[PDB]
Design a protein around this ligand. Structure first.
Ligand SMILES: *[C@@](C)(CO)[C@](*)(O)[C@H](Cc1ccccc1)NC(=O)[C@H](Cc1c[nH]c2ccccc12)NC(=O)[C@@H](C)NC(=O)CN1CCOCC1
Ligand SMILES: *[C@@](C)(CO)[C@](*)(O)[C@H](Cc1ccccc1)NC(=O)[C@H](Cc1c[nH]c2ccccc12)NC(=O)[C@@H](C)NC(=O)CN1CCOCC1
Ligand SMILES: [Mg+2]
Ligand SMILES: [Mg+2]
Ligand SMILES: [Mg+2]
Ligand SMILES: [Mg+2]
Lengths: 226, 222, 195, 211, 204, 233, 196, 195, 196
């Protein structure tokens, strides 16, 4: 995977590619790596795919209950603290590497978190196998006082660098923008630069091509009346 | 500890027609998760209407091809410019590979051309020298993805004639060069989609009695 | 222990099990009965690590006998085999798993059918017309694949079983000291005293 | 692989499968595991394909040279011994080869088993490869010296089928040979898929399998 | 030694036009030894179908477990479980064994009885969901199946056409895997009828 | 079989319309110790070739001597040593590639990654890579070590394929290389600010620039960053 | 990492680099290694970032709870809590921490807590991978009762050299001044300290 | 290979050697003769690693046959045994030692005495009235210690040998497929075809 | 071990401690680590004593034979012979050598040859286990074209600190001055350098 986070004037944006792998094989060509913790707190995960989901759903569940208990909108520092303490407890055996970003009554926030429980603060971050390809773009083009449109461009450019140059990354670009005083906009498949070309031939078979031994109706309905 | 071997990825594919043969391979070269080159030729014209590709560890692949090209040159010197037949080239390559039985060339080798009756020929090798003539063969990273497709679409395996219901097979009708190239292109496009080490470009070498022709096609660069 | 065979014929299930018990380089016993009656119409043979086999078999026997008394009813071979499988599947993720493979031969009095179940130490269950554990199948399954019919008599089943043991005795490096053969049918369980 | 060979009244039968594997992946559906060293000598292949091909083709060179020097065909015994001596040079170097040298010479029909350890055994019947145990089961129960050429060819064919069915690393097709005093005779390539269904119906065997 | 390749087996699922298909081989082995040619790997809980590859004891165990859980779901909810919901249940159940997992590759297939939308999904052994639009593969010939499905598949196929495509993807992938084969079954699933077909294939 | 002791990090390079550019920093690291600060890792061979080397420095100095000896040997009984029979980049590379593969085949490798950059007799650009395994490949952009991961992505944005080479000028190419070297200084812990850059043009020849520094660096934003999560002061 | 804490006339100053590495890759070049566990009690962290963050968070919790019950804790008390965690969990931790704080009674104090979980009170302390290269410089140039400006220069020059030789150290030099006056954060960029 | 026995009686030496040859889990042959005639009145049986055994035995056979032709004279069993020992003692410090254990049974025509020598792969030679290699001695030496006399006939020696094989067949886990028995006396070497 | 060589106006000075350890035991506390391979070409040895002695002996043989044929060798030539041995036998050696010599043409020169067998010409060089602790001090205090007295003080102060922090270093400080005037041996005892 390739993931990034970029801060800007009035908020923060995260982005990710859409490839998942079993070794050198691509399991899913359009995976969703942008996860929702709360409405305006989104995280994006690399490493063990099930761990990034499970840990996100768990903390998101507890965050929702916390938000209900306190009658307040959830804060990113809460999600951060809850995640790192959970991950630290399992000593890196939960292979979740996350970029956590969001807006809350305190302002806009951007953090990274590693599987062992260490956290970092930044204006621009990158995680996953394509982190170096993405960070090269971020170090080249990032500046202070970015606009929303400049930041989405920078973030998606950083993901593309990963898509093209990292074998562990590919397919499409997902984005989520979190601006202060606004609803978060999740832009699923913001970019689609890897559409498969038309095949040369149709491999639709003649009906009767496959040899059959037995046929039978499968009863999926419940036991019937009368 | 020093590891003398490496994996440069790539995938190759040879198909034997009735009076032609093709040897195709992608042009991507890699180590781990990085791309070295998007266009690094892998299939070579070795002379005498024979094409060759050694897929796996590129250093060993380049060395083997280089040695076989040399073997062709010395075959001409030693035997009065006689044409090296495809079967003779195959047996020669076996002995090149087995000379390193205890420190092998880490490659899956395929050659293609025409036999002495003018018919299409493909020979396939393992890293230590076992070889055999075949009709169809995919080698390298995405070999396991492509071969089953070729069993189905070239040799019509598990295909029967409608109406008979498994009693009568689909007859083994021959394929044209235009039909074969379609199967090659679809094979690599499909492999590119599901294999991370396959992509960038596709280079096909076609062998007929008229000589060796090349065709290049773009592949996905992600 | 080593070799345990099973075959399901028309009206019965036949189990054959080796008699040898080895400790170090010495054969301590050549008449060991590697089986336990779980119920009047259900027999279980077993093979695996020393000590674990008998402990597991007797534990299963106790549980089925307890069920029989509690309900005044004999569990079907299928029900018993499922119970046994679960105990092994539970066992494999324990601190110290029980390394036992079993064949369960039973006659279902309800359906009037013989039934043979093969279960390995992982809890891998399969119903079969004939089965074996360990290396026994490598030698015998080719003979069974060839000669086996589902309408075979008990006598024909014993003859085919003799042929399997003869092949084992010829091609195995291991002296397993012959087999004890037991038949499971509608009338219950009996031992073939001459084999 | 599965290979077998046995002597009988009318010579020796030789039968092999044609599968080749690279791990769990089936690399080849049809690989030739017999070598025609000369019109009266055959060699089976089991183990490392490269080792089998290289050393048996080298045996043929050495067997051919014997004919030129002596003006006479090499014996099966002597050919098997040359091969076993080659294996003994690369003792413990990691070669993996199991072969049966089958032929007809002055002593009549001859059959020798030879492997990478240098082991060299004369015998009536042999079977090598991952599926040899399955083949032995059919062979031992149905073998006789008094077999007809037709029945003997079927036995070897049926024995490979048994192994191809049960052994995951054996299959593809069956290659048959019959060695006589006038030389060996090829009796064709038989697809296991088609052969299985045919044998099932005609013989009544494999009742447990549905078709 | 590797639990995911001791017994062998494959499962594949495909979407079509107002239909889905799921198929599996019938082999169960002990490494090289073939043991059973009747070991079906596809189960159903109401109208939701589940295919499971991997270690056979865990396949059997999980079937029994999801039968258990779906029967309780139905008693309490007073309705059959749907594919989208069942998928989440499978993911939950697998991840609760994160550090002592079932060695399996499950595949869900079915049609939502309300929306009528065809649905398939795959998982790794610990629960990560792969909700694909086109197809899902699992087993010892997953690489082979990826190659066949990726080249043979095309969207919006009709039931009787989808049957031929999925059957040929399975059969030819199985014939390049030593640990798969020995028979095959294909389920063709429509909103209110399901057909099950046993295929004729080579038995080696 | 050995292990590298004193090492040099990334070497980066790219093709442009009239030639090639190559660059590498002047550091000789001793593990995590930034031991030697005046190490030249770009080595010119004639006026048409520059060999950039990363990896073990002791092996680099050995290769440097092989090349120096190669020039001497080529001049022997060769009246056209400074003309038609001068050393070509393709000759120098193939020699090195032969040596590297032979050494790995004896299980005693030269622990390096090498990029040979130059311009041939016919004006064609030459740029090819070789390493301790004897693996060779060519591309419009090439980089070793960390450069492969961080520099290539940036350089490939300028020259993504073969057809972009004639469209790329020397000013654009040098700018991209210099920027890449800055990025490597930010992110490679085994890198230095001081570096060397060489341009081999088919018209203007070989320009060798020494004592270059990474400049225009962004650090000001660091003042605002506080704590690792919850800290405000 | 290169970290140090130095006592002087008016109080104590903490200093650190800003580089965090994962092998040879710099994961963060603007890290803040100066962490606050109380108003005027700060620490410098070295070793596992996960371990040192978890510890400092727990310590911050203990001192917050201490303050609520017993008032402002001493720098010695803070160092004891650090120690108790580092010592009792030494088998499962990799943390090398320097504690520094200001009282009006005890003025500036510095405690260092190396791997094993021992405690050592010192006039000044250095730690981290880069400290090895400045043992000689710091020993020769350190004086007691220096001025603030003298102490800032001492830390600047010292960490300048640590950064120069240690690849695991670098970036900016952060400092935190602890006096009666309050808490002053300082920062020094490469273009300033590299030319020393 | 596995079991090789030897016994020296009044006027002859009797060697018994197992017939089994195993490769993997399959017994390839059950009629293998693990012996070579070194000279008309000297027989050597052997057991050890596969391939090495026959190569070593034939190498020794060739050397003794060469000596016999060169001198037109049969070496004494003692001389042969010493030659064999030296070759093994030379072998054990080689790059790849020959892992072969042997029994040398010979009749000395000069002294008119049977002689049995036991030599292991290290080159450890001992003259004995009865001997064995590997685990064979663990089962058989107690019987031989009890029943053996030096004035035994060849028939009595065979009967005591049968008793040793019966004990092996009972207590060994290994099926060695019976033994080939050969007698070495004044008249030369002959095989007992019924045993 | 703590060893260094420093160029200055009139030539070059080599310096070293005198401690040799076998683990924590001091096998020799008065070792002479300054070894002569030619009249005015000396070396400082670090690493395996067996290896460095064997090498320096071979080098002394080569330069003696060189001199008989071609006259006085250069310091560069001496360093090349050291290198050729250290580089070609790197798999079987553990030697870190500093070469220092005086010519009238080239004046004072210093070459360092670390583990791998690379060569580096420098104004001054430091090596040995104790060198790590004085990288910062030496970098800050070294100047070019120092006087003899300034250079002696620089080496004395530097090795004083190396000895202070490194347990593998200690004893006396030996020095060898290489100028046109000749060859001067110096020695400095603990009571002198410890109080610096
Ligand atoms: C890149 C694709 C890196 O490969 C991304 O980080 C990606 C992140 C991601 C996040 C959400 C959804 C999809 C993808 N990571 C993966 O795709 C990840 C690769 C992977 C597999 N095992 C890993 C261990 C440590 C770090 C990364 C790992 N995929 C998975 O984890 C999925 C496919 N699960 C498995 O492959 C399960 N494996 C667990 C152990 O047994 C073998 C199977
Ligand atoms: C069974 C199939 C055992 O698996 C047979 O013995 C078979 C024997 C055989 C002999 C001659 C020709 C073909 C096959 N052996 C193999 O297929 C063998 C099994 C194998 C694989 N690695 C091994 C290591 C040690 C011993 C056996 C091993 N396979 C091979 O040797 C593989 C590497 N060779 C090929 O697949 C040959 N390829 C040549 C190019 O075309 C595709 C096949
Ligand atoms: Mg990519
Ligand atoms: Mg099979
Ligand atoms: Mg002995
Ligand atoms: Mg000291």
């Amino acid at each position: 995977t390739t993931i990034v986070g970029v801060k800007f004037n009035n908020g923060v944006v995260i982005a990710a590619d859409t490839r998942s792998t079993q070794g050198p094989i691509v399991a899913d060509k359009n995976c969703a790596k942008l996860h929702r913790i709360s409405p305006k707190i989104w995280c994006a995960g690399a490493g063990t795919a099930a761990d990034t989901e499970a840990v996100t759903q768990l903390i998101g569940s507890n965050i929702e209950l916390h938000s209900l208990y306190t009658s307040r909108e959830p804060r990113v520092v809460s999600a951060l603290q809850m995640l790192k303490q959970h991950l630290f407890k399992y000593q890196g055996h939960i292979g979740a590497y996350l970029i956590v970003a969001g807006v809350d009554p305190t302002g806009s926030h951007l953090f990274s978190i590693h599987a062992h429980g260490s956290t970092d603060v930044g204006y621009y971050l990158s995680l996953g196998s394509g982190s170096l390809a993405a960070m090269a773009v971020l170090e080249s083009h990032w500046k202070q006082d970015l606009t929303k449109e400049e930041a989405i461009k920078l973030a998606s450019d950083a993901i593309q660098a990963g898509i093209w140059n990292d074998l562990g990354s590919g397919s499409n670009v997902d984005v989520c923008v979190m601006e202060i005083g606004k609803d978060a906009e999740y832009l699923r498949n913001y970019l689609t630069p890897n559409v498969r070309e038309e095949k040369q031939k149709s491999y639709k078979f003649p009906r009767g091509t496959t040899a059959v031994l037995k046929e039978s109706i499968v009863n999926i309905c419940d036991i019937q009346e009368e | 500890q020093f590891n003398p071997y490496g994996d440069n990825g790539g995938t190759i594919l040879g198909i034997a027609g009735e009076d032609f043969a093709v040897l195709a391979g992608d042009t991507r070269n890699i180590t781990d998760y990085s791309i070295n080159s998007r266009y690094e030729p892998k299939v070579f014209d070795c002379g005498d209407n024979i094409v060759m590709s050694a897929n796996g560890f590129a250093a060993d692949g380049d060395a083997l091809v280089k040695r076989f090209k040399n073997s062709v040159k010395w075959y001409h010197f030693d035997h009065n410019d006689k044409k090296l037949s495809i079967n003779s080239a195959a047996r020669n390559i076996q002995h090149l590979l087995y000379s390193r039985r205890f420190f092998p060339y880490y490659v899956y080798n395929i050659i293609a051309g025409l036999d002495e009756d003018g018919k299409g020929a493909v020979y396939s090798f393992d890293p230590v020298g076992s070889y055999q003539r075949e009709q169809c063969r995919a080698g390298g990273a995405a070999a396991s993805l492509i071969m089953p497709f070729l069993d189905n679409q070239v040799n019509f395996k598990n295909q029967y004639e409608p109406g008979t219901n498994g009693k009568v097979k689909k007859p083994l009708k021959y394929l044209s060069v235009e039909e074969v190239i379609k199967l090659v292109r679809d094979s690599f496009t499909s492999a590119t989609e599901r294999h991370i080490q396959v992509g960038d470009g596709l280079e096909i070498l076609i062998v007929t009695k008229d000589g060796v022709r090349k065709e290049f096609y773009e592949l996905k660069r992600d | 222990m080593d070799i345990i065979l099973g075959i399901r014929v028309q009206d019965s299930v036949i189990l054959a099990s080796s008699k040898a018990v080895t400790r170090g380089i010495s054969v301590l016993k050549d008449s060991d009965d590697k089986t336990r009656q779980l119920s009047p119409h259900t027999l279980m043979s077993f093979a695996g690590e020393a000590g674990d086999t008998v402990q597991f078999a007797e534990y299963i026997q106790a549980n089925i006998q307890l069920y029989s008394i509690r309900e005044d009813y004999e569990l079907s071979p299928q029900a018993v085999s499922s119970f046994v499988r679960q105990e092994l599947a539970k066992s494999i993720r324990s601190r110290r798993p029980y390394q036992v493979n079993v064949l369960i031969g039973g006659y279902d009095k309800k359906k009037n059918k013989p039934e043979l179940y093969q279960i390995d130490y992982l809890g891998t269950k399969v119903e079969l017309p004939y089965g074996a554990h360990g290396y026994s199948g490598f030698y015998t399954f080719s003979l069974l694949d060839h000669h086996y019919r589902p309408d075979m008599t008990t006598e024909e089943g014993l003859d085919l079983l003799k042929l399997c043991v003869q092949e084992l005795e010829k091609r195995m490096p291991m002296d397993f000291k012959g087999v004890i053969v037991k038949i499971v049918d509608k009338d219950g369980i009996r031992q073939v005293d001459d084999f | 692989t599965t290979t077998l060979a046995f002597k009988f009244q009318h010579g020796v039968i030789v039968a092999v499968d044609s599968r080749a594997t690279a791990g769990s992946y089936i690399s080849s559906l049809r690989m030739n595991k017999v070598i025609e060293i000369n019109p009266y000598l055959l060699g089976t292949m089991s183990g490392c394909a490269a080792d089998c091909q290289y050393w048996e083709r080298l045996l043929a060179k050495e067997c051919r040279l014997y004919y030129l020097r002596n003006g006479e065909r090499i014996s099966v015994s002597a050919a098997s011994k040359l091969l076993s001596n080659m294996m003994l040079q690369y003792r413990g170097m990691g070669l993996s080869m199991g072969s049966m040298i089958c032929g007809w010479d002055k002593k009549g029909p001859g059959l020798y088993y030879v492997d990478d350890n240098g082991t060299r055994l004369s015998g009536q019947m042999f079977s090598t490869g991952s599926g040899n145990t399955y083949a032995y089961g059919v062979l031992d129960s149905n073998y006789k010296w008094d077999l007809s050429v037709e029945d003997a060819l079927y036995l070897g064919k049926r024995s490979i089928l048994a192994a191809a069915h049960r052994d995951a690393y054996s299959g593809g097709s069956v290659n048959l040979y019959h060695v006589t005093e006038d030389g060996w005779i090829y009796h064709g390539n038989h697809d296991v898929g088609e052969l299985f269904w045919k044998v099932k119906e005609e013989e009544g065997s494999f009742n447990n399998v549905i078709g | 030694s590797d639990p995911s390749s001791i017994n062998g087996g494959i499962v594949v699922a495909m979407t079509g036009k107002d239909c889905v298909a799921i198929a599996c081989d019938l082999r169960l082995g002990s490494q090289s030894l073939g043991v059973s040619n009747k070991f079906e790997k596809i189960f159903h809980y109401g109208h939701v179908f589940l295919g499971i590859t991997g270690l056979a004891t865990d396949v059997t165990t999980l079937n029994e477990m999801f039968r258990y859980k779906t029967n309780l779901y139905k008693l309490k909810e007073e309705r059959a479980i749907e594919p989208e919901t069942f998928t989440q249940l499978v993911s939950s159940s697998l991840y609760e064994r994160r550090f002592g997992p079932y060695f399996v590759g499950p595949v869900v297939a079915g049609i939502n009885s309300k929306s009528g939308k065809p649905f398939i999904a795959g998982f790794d052994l610990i629960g990560c969901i792969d909700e694909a639009k086109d197809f899902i593969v699992s087993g010892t010939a997953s690489d082979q199946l990826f190659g066949m499905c990726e080249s043979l598949y095309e969207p919006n196929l009709e039931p009787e056409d989808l049957f031929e495509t999925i059957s040929q993807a399975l059969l030819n992938a199985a014939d390049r895997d030593a640990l798969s084969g020995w028979g095959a079954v294909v389920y063709i699933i429509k909103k209110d009828e399901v057909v099950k077909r046993y295929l004729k294939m080579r038995q080696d | 079989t050995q292990q590298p002791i004193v090492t040099g990090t990334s070497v980066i390079s790219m093709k442009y319309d009239n030639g090639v550019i190559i660059a590498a920093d002047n550091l000789g690291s001793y593990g995590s110790l930034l031991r030697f600060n005046g190490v030249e890792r770009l080595i010119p061979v004639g006026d048409n070739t520059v060999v950039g080397i990363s990896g073990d420095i002791s092996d680099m100095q050995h290769i440097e001597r092989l090349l120096k000896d190669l020039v001497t040997e080529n001049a022997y009984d060769n009246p056209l040593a400074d003309a038609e029979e001068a050393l070509e980049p393709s000759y120098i590379f193939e020699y090195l590639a032969t040596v590297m593969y032979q050494r790995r085949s004896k299980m005693n490798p030269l622990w390096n990654a090498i990029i040979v950059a130059g311009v041939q007799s016919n004006g064609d650009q030459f740029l090819r890579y070789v390493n301790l395994l004897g693996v060779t490949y060519s591309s419009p952009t090439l980089a070793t070590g960390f450069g492969a991961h961080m520099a290539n992505p940036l350089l490939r944005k300028v020259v993504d394929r073969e057809s972009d080479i004639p469209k790329t000028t020397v000013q654009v190419a040098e700018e991209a290389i210099v920027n890449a070297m800055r990025v490597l200084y930010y992110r490679d812990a085994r890198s230095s600010r001081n570096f060397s850059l060489a341009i081999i043009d088919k018209n203007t020849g070989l320009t060798f620039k020494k004592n270059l520094q990474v400049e225009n660096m962004k650090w000001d934003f660091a003042k605002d960053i506080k704590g690792y999560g919850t800290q405000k002061i | 990492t290169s970290i140090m804490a130095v006592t002087f006339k008016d109080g104590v100053i903490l200093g650190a680099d800003s580089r965090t590495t994962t092998g040879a890759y710099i994961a963060n070049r603007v890290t803040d290694k100066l962490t606050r566990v109380h108003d005027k009690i700060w620490c410098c962290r070295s070793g596992s970032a996960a371990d040192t963050q978890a510890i400092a968070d727990i310590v911050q919790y203990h001192l917050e709870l201490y303050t609520s019950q017993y008032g402002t804790p001493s720098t010695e008390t803070a160092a004891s809590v650090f120690k108790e965690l580092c010592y009792e969990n030494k088998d499962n931790l990799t943390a090398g921490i320097i504690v520094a704080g200001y009282d009006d009674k005890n003025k500036g104090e510095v405690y260092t807590i190396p791997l094993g979980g021992s405690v050592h009170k010192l006039p000044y302390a250095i730690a981290g991978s880069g400290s090895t290269f400045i043992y000689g410089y710091c020993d020769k140039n350190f004086r007691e009762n220096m001025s603030k400006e003298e102490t800032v220069d001492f830390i600047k020059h010292s960490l300048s050299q640590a950064i120069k030789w240690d690849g695991s150290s670098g970036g900016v030099i952060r400092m935190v001044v602890l006096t009666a006056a309050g808490v002053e954060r300082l920062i020094f960029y490469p273009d300033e300290y590299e030319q020393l």
